[PDB]
Symmetry: C4
């Protein structure tokens, strides 16, 4: 299982989904971690009626875990209705910041469950969160067009 999770992370690190900034988009955010210095620029696009995430595009520098996590994020939320995307994000963030007491559900997170073991390394939690909290922020800002 430990070895399987490693393979998931390597798969997403080497074969990132949805990498590189694209247009169109509703909101861009730039998040820089104040501790490790790594950064993500992330864009969200919504459908015409604002109900679905139609694109998530991103660039930046980080460790393999943060790059893998942002890859997994895009695969889980693109095409999803906004409330569902938010639910996935809350599930992921609950899991990685639970200090190992919340295992995560693969039916919700998919490959996202591969980051369960990060929860037991406090200084690496930020790596899993960088892209996901950038998404939460960008999704909120893009959604303002539809309030």
């Amino acid at each position: 299982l430990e070895q399987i999770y490693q393979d998931v992370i390597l798969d997403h690190y080497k074969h990132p989904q949805h990498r590189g900034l694209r247009e169109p988009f509703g909101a861009q955010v730039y998040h820089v971690n104040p501790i490790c210095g790594d950064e993500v620029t992330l864009r969200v696009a919504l459908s015409e009626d604002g109900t679905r995430v139609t694109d998530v595009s991103y660039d930046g520098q980080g460790c393999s875990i943060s790059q893998a996590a942002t890859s997994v994020l895009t695969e889980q939320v693109i095409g999803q209705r906004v409330p569902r995307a938010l639910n996935i994000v809350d599930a992921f963030t609950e899991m990685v910041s639970s200090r190992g007491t919340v295992p995560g559900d693969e039916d919700v997170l998919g490959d996202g469950v591969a980051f369960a073991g990060v929860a037991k390394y406090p200084a690496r939690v930020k790596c899993a969160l960088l892209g996901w909290m950038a998404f939460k922020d960008a999704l909120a800002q893009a959604s303002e067009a539809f309030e």
Copy 2:
């Protein structure tokens, strides 16, 4: 109209007017958007008597909308007397931050009216403003030589 405005923006994105920093100049400003991380460095030059904008030069990174908007800015204000430039800037900023309730006048703004639809996307308003507020700031600073 929606399709026409798209063409204006693409025209200015692909064929930017007045791009690249030049000398001489009266003031340079560096503006970085704290949300999206994009930036503009912008210079203003005034005539010998300080009554006309003789140059606006710029560099930086941004989305296609912000780059297009800065291109349009330069075309509208270069050669203009300072009070007129200020009037154009106020008209543009009124338009893009009106949430769609101010359509903008093409006789004042020219191609600037192509950014009317941005007003309905709160998270993209910053894109239209980046270069224009840099200009307002640089013009004010360059004008201090003539008070």
Copy 3:
């Protein structure tokens, strides 16, 4: 002695030990000196039981003294039990910030004693500390996994 210490520093500057960021790791820190503008990104890896420093990897820009000091740091602490690493760091920092009144012990510091003369140049003390305080910070953060 003055000439010998110069050779140590040049040796580590030209032939850096352990340079370049590597995986795996427990914590990364990014430290930027607010005065000179130089920076280090530094990673620490601990053993499975968290008792030994198994890796220290780093990148960044600095003067030859700061680059040499980070090289020496890695050679002194990699393979060491955590309490011993901390003891070496405290000895080094005591030495360089003592204004020359603490000569340092080569049995503890090894090549680290070559930085004794830096202590008499207040504005260069930061150069010796940059990598060492980055290590102290990263080691502390990596250790949180084992509390």
Copy 4:
């Protein structure tokens, strides 16, 4: 005179004296202008007894005026006793920030008098000061070794 001063500035812009960071040095400072975004990294070296400026080395980005001014700085202060360097700096800064009421003396400043006309452009005063205030700061820090 206006045309002569232009030639001085162009001469120093195209043929900078003492450009590029060098070792050894006593202090490095990194100054970033908060308005225009330009920056200088500047090093000072003093003699063994701390009485003379033996080197000033620098790098960074700026307009032609700021680059020319830093070039002129190095030519005026390198080889000078510290109190004399300070006197030159105070004379230069008095001149450029006097709003044109202090013409500057060529026997003190040399080519530095070419920046007299900058004083009448408030937004360009920062350009003349960037390198000179970096020097004042670095000289002070390097001098701490000799208090």
